[PDB]
Amino acid sequence: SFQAECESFKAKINVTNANVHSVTYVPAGVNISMADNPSPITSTFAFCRIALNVTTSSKSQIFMEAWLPSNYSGRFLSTGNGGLGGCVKYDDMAYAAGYGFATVGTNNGHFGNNGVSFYQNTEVVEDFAYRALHTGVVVGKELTKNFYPQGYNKSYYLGCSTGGRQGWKSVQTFPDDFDGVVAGAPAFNFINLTSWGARFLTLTGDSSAETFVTETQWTAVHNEIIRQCDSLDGAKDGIIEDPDLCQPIIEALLCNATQSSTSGTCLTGAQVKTVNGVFSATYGLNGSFLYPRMQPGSELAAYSSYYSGTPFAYAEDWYRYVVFNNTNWDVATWTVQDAAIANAQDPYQISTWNGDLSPFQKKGGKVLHYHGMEDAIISSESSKVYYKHVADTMNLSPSELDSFYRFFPISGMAHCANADGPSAIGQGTGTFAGNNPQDNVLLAMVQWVEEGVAPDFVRGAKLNGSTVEYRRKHCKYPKRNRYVGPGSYTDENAWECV
Amino acid sequence: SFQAECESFKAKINVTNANVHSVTYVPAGVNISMADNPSICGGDPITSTFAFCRIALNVTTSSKSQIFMEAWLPSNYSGRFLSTGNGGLGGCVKYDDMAYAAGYGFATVGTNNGHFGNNGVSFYQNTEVVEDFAYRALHTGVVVGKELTKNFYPQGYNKSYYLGCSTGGRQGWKSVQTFPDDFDGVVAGAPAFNFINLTSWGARFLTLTGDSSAETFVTETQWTAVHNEIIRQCDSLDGAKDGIIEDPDLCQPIIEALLCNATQSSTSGTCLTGAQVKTVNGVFSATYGLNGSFLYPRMQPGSELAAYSSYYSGTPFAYAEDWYRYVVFNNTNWDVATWTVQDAAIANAQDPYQISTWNGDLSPFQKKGGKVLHYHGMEDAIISSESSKVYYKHVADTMNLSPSELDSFYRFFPISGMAHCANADGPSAIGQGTGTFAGNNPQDNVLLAMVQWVEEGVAPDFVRGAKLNGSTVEYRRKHCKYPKRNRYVGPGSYTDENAWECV
């Protein structure tokens, strides 16, 4: 039986410098156990579950899992990580393994979503920057070939945020790891992203500062952005389809004489200047471009991530434990000088900004990149600047890039999750809205790789719990989606990519 | 008789530091003579449509500086005083503007700004000539002009006005910011304020393009392809497919669209290399300096056809070379191609006589009842219109006044379809001079709108402009008061001004 062959496979495993913790059989219809997930998902499929550590240096190691389904498709898949973790993405493992992929995930070289394990340990950094992900691919392919007589044919990657960065690190630096890569909201330009995150507190101050903008004021700011910008795409639907067109004039919210900013409905000049800073690109020494602006429209959730007047953990950790080796360093004191030090350091090219994709192109790889337009954690503009960087570095036009690299801005989408629009594009269980390839980016990538049928658009649904209210076809960049009618803006065919 | 009064005036003038060259009566219907206009400013014509008394004089401003100025005192006098301004690094009296104003009956002045010619060489070794250019020539012309006007007319003058664009727009804003008592009403177009960083931004273009042989260089034909692609991407954002980018802020063009395909070569002029697209992206990028500080906004997309000549042609930019040679470095051999942000930091710290003109606190002018109407064309190839928008926002946030509060005394109107202080292809003729004249209704004539605002309290809620075919008005549009955006909504054609809404 599949089960019996699983439950005695441990003895066959031959991975070097590794410690196999368990080999278990997981039937369909159980909540998958999580005792190895540091301080539930119902399987709809059976699989063989291998958990192990792999040593990656004299001072570092990974934890990883491989999920080898009984209903195996002959395809291998790696998931990735989030933040500064540290945490296997079991949700995405289940998503992929449900489609019959031999699926792996690693902890990225440490446990927990924080940087403390980097302190005085450059090898744990090297794992975070590239090596943990690639190790999980190498070991996962070994396990998969050992378990299934037929081995695997094509290899895929699914990940968002840090996982988006990890997919792009694969494309740029390990072209042979994957045939098809689905990379969302990527944490590439990583050092400058991290700096940009630190910059927010320097602009806002703490909650007592004259520069601070309250949450109710951010809501007013949000509403005024919607007013100025919603209709630019042609549809008055509460959604900024393409924030590039939105260049908001926040001075519209300066208080009139009968109003006080304490009411939350208007802002002072100093407060407006904070908000303008949020909506401005960050430049460094010598006037070099560091990071784009926050795209307008992400305000509600961006209050939680960045604007609340408290230190941004990821940056605090990165600067304390990687940049400066100073556990007491006060992120509020961040400056562009600090950013220049961090950039010079760029450990293991975690920047992940190589624009020359030729090796991956020439080996026949395909990469589908997306980013949400309401992203409150990683500005979508970063992904558009990256696309331009690839085009200009390779000297390849968009229509030439389309042979191997297609990028889809998603309206109405948050950070690796739904927002309030047609965001459910099938990048994971949380964004699932069907199995037609046009509706599911994972299955679109299998179609592109195996049948040559390339995504011209990425269709997303606006869900109400489980019900599809409407869908929209998100355009292939650089085309812009515009509402033209004659039907309602809920009619996908009332939109055109131009 | 007026003519007799003119003929007896020279002997009556007695103004400190003034040497009066001539007082002449000029009838209507004659070419206005140009003996005192040097070759460098075009020498010798404008035909008068009004009679006036013409006073030409020099006024010493230091031991080693002086201005030339004129005052034109019309016989059909309205009781109003007006000063014109200058252009470029000049140096030349704007006689066209003087005739524009004097024909409305203003007692009108202009000065040469402290030297003759549109170039910076009179700055060589002479800070006093720089001071004249930065503020003091214009102000001296006002003080001396008011004295002459009071001396000549029994009734003196009542309100005082300013009309200027480009350098002249900076000059008007310098007045508002630093000489609030000079004018009651100021009409300031496409201003060369943020002057140091404007000049630096001009120097930056060659650093991006290289010369005509560089791999970074984008040819004129390529710039036309870029232009057409920008119109493709951006025309319809305002609602109207009319060939005009109504508000370039919405236009964030993706130049990568013009990367060559595999059968195409950039030598065609129709597509660009990666390096060439990077050049264009730099043109459409803001300039930042040391410590990552904002220096100057991007060039607004849409100005490409004329901006090839002004900036993109692979040749040093004269204004900036002269400014850095004679003012920043005091080295006549300095090579502008070597410009860096460190050079711009030096220049900014120097800021001679606050020529930057960036003061955002207009409280003194507000408190004395002054009004300022500011405009800028959206197709400006010389001074990016974004500079004016950044300035507006700077005033609001520095004064802590909302737009509706500022509306009591300071109103700003982006003008679509307009070039640098001139008509382009759209409804640009707003009455800021002879060259933009489209009638005398105050809503169509910004000079007369200002008279109405100061004297009757009726402020401009919009500035209407005309699209002219020779002297025929094809159509008009009401340009919105910033921050509102003009959007085309129908039901009429985009030529129907009622088919647009300010939002």
Ligand SMILES: *[C@@H]1O[C@H](CO)[C@@H](O)[C@H](O)[C@H]1NC(C)=O
């Ligand atoms: C596996 O490696 C991790 C660091 O990645 C270490 O925390 C852990 O102790 C190791 N063993 C496990 C998870 O059983």
Ligand SMILES: *[C@@H]1O[C@H](CO)[C@@H](O)[C@H](O)[C@H]1NC(C)=O
């Ligand atoms: C200020 O008043 C104007 C004119 O009534 C109004 O349009 C604007 O929204 C007001 N501003 C605030 C912040 O409410």
Ligand SMILES: *[C@@H]1O[C@H](CO)[C@@H](O)[C@H](O)[C@H]1NC(C)=O
């Ligand atoms: C990161 O910012 C630095 C300035 O500190 C700059 O040198 C570098 O180009 C930036 N990198 C990217 C990829 O934006």
Ligand SMILES: *[C@@H]1O[C@H](CO)[C@@H](O)[C@H](O)[C@H]1NC(C)=O
């Ligand atoms: C010219 O003005 C000076 C100073 O006020 C005065 O001394 C002189 O008498 C005046 N000349 C005549 C002819 O009035």
Ligand SMILES: *[C@@H]1O[C@H](CO)[C@@H](O)[C@H](O)[C@H]1NC(C)=O
């Ligand atoms: C007036 O001053 C100018 C300098 O601004 C000088 O060049 C000229 O010689 C002086 N005299 C005349 C008649 O223009």
Ligand SMILES: *[C@@H]1O[C@H](CO)[C@@H](O)[C@H](O)[C@H]1NC(C)=O
């Ligand atoms: C310019 O340099 C000269 C020496 O060549 C010096 O005497 C002068 O003070 C400097 N500055 C000027 C002329 O504004």
Ligand SMILES: *[C@@H]1O[C@H](CO)[C@@H](O)[C@H](O)[C@H]1NC(C)=O
């Ligand atoms: C390159 O080919 C594409 C697809 O045919 C076309 O749309 C695009 O305009 C072409 N690019 C150039 C510069 O002509």
Ligand SMILES: *[C@@H]1O[C@H](CO)[C@@H](O)[C@H](O)[C@H]1NC(C)=O
């Ligand atoms: C001019 O650029 C400099 C860079 O040294 C900056 O300090 C200054 O703020 C800029 N001024 C304006 C008005 O943008």
Ligand SMILES: [Ca+2]
């Ligand atoms: Ca919308």
Ligand SMILES: [Ca+2]
């Ligand atoms: Ca238009």
